[PDB]
Coordinates of C-alpha atoms and ligand atoms in Angstrom, one line a residue:
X1 CA 190.9 20.9 40.2
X2 CA 189.9 19.6 43.6
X3 CA 192.6 17.8 45.7
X4 CA 191.5 15.0 47.9
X5 CA 193.3 13.1 50.7
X6 CA 192.9 9.3 50.6
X7 CA 192.3 7.5 53.8
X8 CA 195.1 5.1 54.8
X9 CA 194.0 1.9 53.0
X10 CA 193.3 3.6 49.7
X11 CA 196.5 5.5 50.0
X12 CA 198.5 2.2 50.3
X13 CA 196.6 0.8 47.3
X14 CA 197.6 3.9 45.3
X15 CA 201.2 3.6 46.4
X16 CA 201.2 -0.1 45.3
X17 CA 200.8 1.2 41.7
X18 CA 203.5 3.8 42.0
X19 CA 201.6 6.9 43.4
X20 CA 204.0 9.1 45.3
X21 CA 201.8 11.9 46.5
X22 CA 199.8 12.8 49.7
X23 CA 196.9 14.4 47.9
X24 CA 195.4 13.8 44.4
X25 CA 192.9 15.1 41.9
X26 CA 189.9 12.8 41.3
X27 CA 191.4 12.2 37.8
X28 CA 194.7 10.9 39.1
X29 CA 192.8 8.6 41.6
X30 CA 190.8 7.2 38.8
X31 CA 193.9 6.7 36.6
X32 CA 195.8 4.9 39.4
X33 CA 192.7 2.7 40.3
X34 CA 192.5 1.8 36.6
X35 CA 196.1 0.8 36.6
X36 CA 195.5 -1.3 39.8
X37 CA 192.5 -3.0 38.1
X38 CA 194.7 -3.8 35.0
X39 CA 197.7 -5.0 37.1
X40 CA 195.6 -7.2 39.3
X41 CA 193.4 -8.4 36.3
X42 CA 190.2 -7.5 38.2
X43 CA 188.5 -6.9 34.9
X44 CA 187.1 -10.0 33.1
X45 CA 188.7 -11.2 29.9
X46 CA 185.3 -12.1 28.3
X47 CA 182.9 -9.8 30.0
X48 CA 182.7 -6.1 29.2
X49 CA 182.6 -3.3 31.8
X50 CA 182.5 -5.4 34.9
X51 CA 185.3 -5.3 37.5
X52 CA 185.4 -8.2 39.9
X53 CA 186.8 -7.1 43.2
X54 CA 185.3 -9.6 45.7
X55 CA 188.7 -11.3 46.3
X56 CA 190.6 -8.1 46.5
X57 CA 191.5 -5.2 48.8
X58 CA 189.6 -3.0 46.3
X59 CA 186.4 -4.9 47.2
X60 CA 187.0 -4.3 50.8
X61 CA 187.5 -0.6 50.2
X62 CA 184.5 -0.1 47.8
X63 CA 182.2 -2.3 49.8
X64 CA 181.0 -4.3 46.8
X65 CA 181.9 -7.6 45.1
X66 CA 181.6 -6.2 41.6
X67 CA 180.6 -3.0 39.6
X68 CA 180.4 -1.7 36.1
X69 CA 182.9 1.0 35.0
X70 CA 180.0 2.7 33.2
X71 CA 178.4 3.7 36.6
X72 CA 180.4 6.8 37.2
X73 CA 178.2 8.3 40.0
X74 CA 178.4 5.0 41.9
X75 CA 182.2 4.9 41.4
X76 CA 182.5 8.4 42.8
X77 CA 180.6 7.4 45.9
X78 CA 182.8 4.3 46.4
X79 CA 186.0 6.4 46.1
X80 CA 184.7 9.2 48.3
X81 CA 184.0 6.6 51.1
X82 CA 187.8 6.3 51.1
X83 CA 188.7 10.0 51.1
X84 CA 189.0 12.4 54.1
Ligands
LIG101 C1 190.3 11.7 33.8 C2 190.5 10.2 34.1 O1 189.3 9.5 34.1 C3 189.1 8.1 34.3 C4 190.1 7.2 34.2 C5 189.9 5.8 34.3 C6 188.5 5.4 34.5 C7 187.5 6.3 34.6 C8 187.8 7.7 34.4 O2 186.8 8.7 34.5 C9 185.4 8.5 34.5 C10 184.9 8.4 35.9 C11 188.2 3.9 34.6 C12 187.9 3.5 36.0 C13 186.6 3.1 36.4 C14 186.4 2.7 37.7 C15 187.4 2.8 38.7 CL1 187.2 2.3 40.4 C16 188.7 3.2 38.3 C17 188.9 3.6 37.0 N1 189.3 3.0 34.1 C18 188.8 1.7 33.7 C19 189.0 0.6 34.5 C20 188.6 -0.6 34.1 C21 187.9 -0.8 32.9 C22 187.4 -2.1 32.4 C23 187.7 0.3 32.0 C24 188.2 1.6 32.5 O3 188.1 2.8 31.7 C25 187.4 2.9 30.5 C26 186.0 3.2 30.7 N2 185.5 3.9 31.9 N3 184.1 3.9 31.7 N4 183.9 3.3 30.6 N5 185.0 2.8 30.0 C27 190.6 3.4 33.9 O4 191.4 2.6 33.4 C28 191.0 4.8 34.2
LIG102 C1 174.6 15.0 42.3 C2 175.0 13.5 42.5 O1 174.2 12.7 41.6 C3 174.0 11.4 41.9 C4 174.8 10.6 42.8 C5 174.6 9.3 43.0 C6 173.5 8.6 42.4 C7 172.6 9.4 41.6 C8 172.9 10.7 41.3 O2 172.0 11.5 40.5 C9 170.9 10.9 39.8 C10 169.7 10.8 40.7 C11 173.2 7.2 42.7 C12 172.0 7.1 43.6 C13 170.7 6.5 43.1 C14 169.6 6.5 44.0 C15 169.8 7.0 45.3 CL1 168.4 7.0 46.4 C16 171.0 7.6 45.8 C17 172.1 7.6 44.9 N1 174.3 6.4 43.3 C18 174.1 5.0 43.3 C19 173.8 4.3 44.5 C20 173.6 2.9 44.6 C21 173.8 2.2 43.4 C22 173.6 0.7 43.4 C23 174.1 2.8 42.2 C24 174.3 4.2 42.1 O3 174.6 5.0 41.0 C25 174.5 4.3 39.7 C26 175.0 5.3 38.7 N2 174.1 6.3 38.0 N3 175.0 7.0 37.2 N4 176.2 6.5 37.4 N5 176.2 5.5 38.3 C27 175.4 7.0 43.9 O4 176.2 6.3 44.4 C28 175.5 8.5 43.9

């Protein structure tokens, strides 16, 4: 139920995929990031689970060049780095 306030860069990213809010549940953040990954085609066509964000704003925000979507605890850390 927790509402979080994204830092400026993550907030702009969320707004790029149609987010209209100031604060978000972690669920909404994950949905919007998933939409971002889909729209920017940061997932690989052939390779399961891996998101390639090295060329992308997302990579700048997360501080990694790639990650697996299976690693939920790591994903939470990467997002929380970008929350107030
Ligand atoms: C209540 C809503 O919850 C979630 C929604 C979404 C995800 C995880 C969630 O919750 C778990 C933390 C993840 C995802 C992973 C990491 C981030 Cl940086 C962003 C989004 N995703 C997603 C993105 C890419 C790929 C290849 C599979 C995905 O998703 C199936 C998948 N996820 N894990 N295995 N398969 C979404 O499109 C939305
Ligand atoms: C109550 C919160 O729980 C946890 C949170 C986190 C982790 C483990 C947890 O609990 C298990 C010990 C682990 C991690 C591993 C060891 C330590 Cl020395 C520090 C952090 N991690 C994490 C860090 C780096 C990498 C490359 C992957 C990670 O994570 C994979 C991963 N594991 N599960 N999903 N993704 C986190 O970013 C947060």
